[PDB]
Structure formats: structure tokens, C-alpha cells
Amino acid sequence: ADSCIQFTRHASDVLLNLNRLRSRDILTDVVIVVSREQFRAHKTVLMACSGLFYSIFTDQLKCNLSVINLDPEINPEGFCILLDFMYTSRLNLREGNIMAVMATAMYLQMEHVVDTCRKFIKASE
Amino acid sequence: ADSCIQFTRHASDVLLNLNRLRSRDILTDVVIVVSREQFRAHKTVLMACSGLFYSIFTDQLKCNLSVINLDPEINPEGFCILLDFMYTSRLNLREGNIMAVMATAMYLQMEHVVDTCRKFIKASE
């Protein structure tokens, strides 16, 4: 109905509890492997944040896999930073990690992140 | 790190995509039964929004159930309104549904909703 009321902090409170479930390894259903480093996560959160994961988990065969291996060129620290951003809205962008974070966000199809990385790089030139 | 930047709309964008997955019945993993009416949902979203569902899906036996039956006193329309709120932050509170919505939120242990219902009732007295 058009007469709904809205709770401002609801979406942020849901994301905080989804990250608490990840921290405690509760109902995680996939392992993402990046150059032998392993990251446990929830498929629904990955799909909600990334064009690449949305395409992977809507495929009739890949939706049932419990392990997904990323391209060997992907940096594990860059992936870790982006997985933390998916679950918290906070991005740990630093001079020493920005090139890896940008390349990983291009691969994962996370366009807001790619745009912000490009702007921070352009400001230093 | 304490030098993170934050994307304001990220949590709301994640919740919008979780509701799109629910609409299309993608990776839903539980059916909630309320007086023979059936509602498909994601266990992680239910746990993130409700004290009752958090307790149910952290139990070592109930975590593996694919169907959960609610108490026969629970109203299906009240449950439907609260499930929509979990996935959108919007609550369709009307004079004709407020008593059922409040009783359902007390059972589900959704305290912000219980408080708002009490205030709207107190204003009409």
C-alpha cells in the first residue's frame, strides 16, 4: 500500500546481523577460493552485491556448487577487502591496495566501487 | 582499519536485491506455514530480523528443517505484513490490521515494531 511508514535504520541493522552470522560461520553455504586462500560466505549476500556472483548462482548447474574458484590473477587481499565491504558498507581503500581493489571490483562487477577507485587515482595524478 | 570510507546507500541496495530474489523464488530455503497459508523465504533474512527465527535456526536440529509451522493463533495477514517489512523496511500499518500486526510482532520478537504499534494505539485512545 502507499500508506506505509518506514524504519530508517532497518536495512543497516539487517546487514549488521548478516555480518555477525558470517563471523560466527552460521548458515554459510559457499567457500570462495582465491589463490589457495579460502573465504566462507552466504550465496544470497554475494549475489546481492556483485554482477559476477549474481550470474554464477542463477546458473542451473553452478547454483548447487559449494566451492567456487576465482581467476588466478585475482589478489586475495583485494578480495578480502571487497567481501568486508559487501557485509558492512565500509571500504578500506589505501594507497598500497587501491590498484588491486579496483581490478578485483572490475572482475566482480561492483561498479560503484570501480568508479570511486578511478576518482581517488585521478586525484593523485 | 579506522580509515574506511562508507557508501550510504549500500545497505538499502542489498535489501532491495534480497527482496528481488524472494519475488523470483531464487535460493529460498524454508517455507513458513501460518494456518495452512505458505510463505517462502531465506533463513538468513528471517534470523537477521527476528528473535524467534534467530533462536529457531541456531538450534542444531531445527536449522535443517525446510518447513516451520507457526502457532495456530497467528494471523496470516499479520505475518505477511511483517515478512514484507523484513525485506523492505516498510510497514503497512492500518486501523484494521494493527492489533494482528502487534500480536504477531510480539510472537516473532521484533521489538521496534511492537513499540511503534503501542504508540499508534495510545494516540487513538
Binding site: C4, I5, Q6, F7, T8, R9 | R90, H112, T116
Partner: peptide
């Protein structure tokens, strides 16, 4: 919290 969206 609550607002008119």
C-alpha cells in the same frame, strides 16, 4: 526512528 517515505 520511523518516517513517511
Amino acid at each position: 526512528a520511523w518516517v513517511i517515505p
